[PDB]
Amino acid sequence: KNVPHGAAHIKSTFNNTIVSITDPQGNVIAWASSGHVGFKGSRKSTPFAAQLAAENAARKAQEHGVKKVDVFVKGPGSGRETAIRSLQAAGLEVGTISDVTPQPHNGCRPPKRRR
């Protein structure tokens, strides 16, 4: 309902860019993905899709009263910084950035190498 300070969790993969604006406790109040802002397939992986996703989630959060946001970015992607700029432009102001990508300690064998 009212959350002045929030957290923007950004999962930017090689196939999408999901953005979840949450309270600092982690309860989501808004989110947006490329598919939600009207994309499909491989265009979801573009930075522009992340621009729009971040913009839409930021607007839905502004509706709830979110001004300062701390970012928690994860995933290689290409629309990370694009989403940062989008949040900065969609009315919010970013306080802190953090690469929270999972770094396993050599556990859980990955999938095989693509040929």
Residue of 6, 8, 10, 45 that binds RNA (CB under 7 A):
45
Token duo for residue 93: 């102001």
CB 50 within 8 A of CB 12: yes
Q: Does 103 help bind RNA (rule: CB under 7 A)?
A: yes
89-103 per-residue burial string, b: 16 or more CB within 10 A, e: under 16: ebebeeeeeeeeeee
Sheet holding 68-74, edge to edge: 28-32, 17-22, 5-12, 68-74, 93-96
Q: Please report how the helices 47-62 and 80-89 are oriented relative to each other, as an axis angle in degrees rounded to 10.
A: 30
Region of 65-73, 76-84, 91-99, 107-115 interacting with RNA (CB under 7 A): 107-115
Give the CA distances from residue 60 to residues 1, 81, 99, in Å, rounded to whole numbers and listed in that order: 11, 20, 24
Residue of 31, 51, 54, 57 that binds RNA (CB under 7 A):
31
Residue of 2, 76, 108, 113 that binds RNA (CB under 7 A):
108
Region of 9-17, 65-73, 77-85, 88-96 interacting with RNA (CB under 7 A): 9-17
Number of residues that bind RNA (CB under 7 A): 33
List the x/- string, 54-73, binding to RNA by CB under 7 A. --------------------
Which positions touch RNA (CB under 7 A)? 11, 13-16, 18, 22-23, 25-31, 33-36, 40-45, 102-108, 114
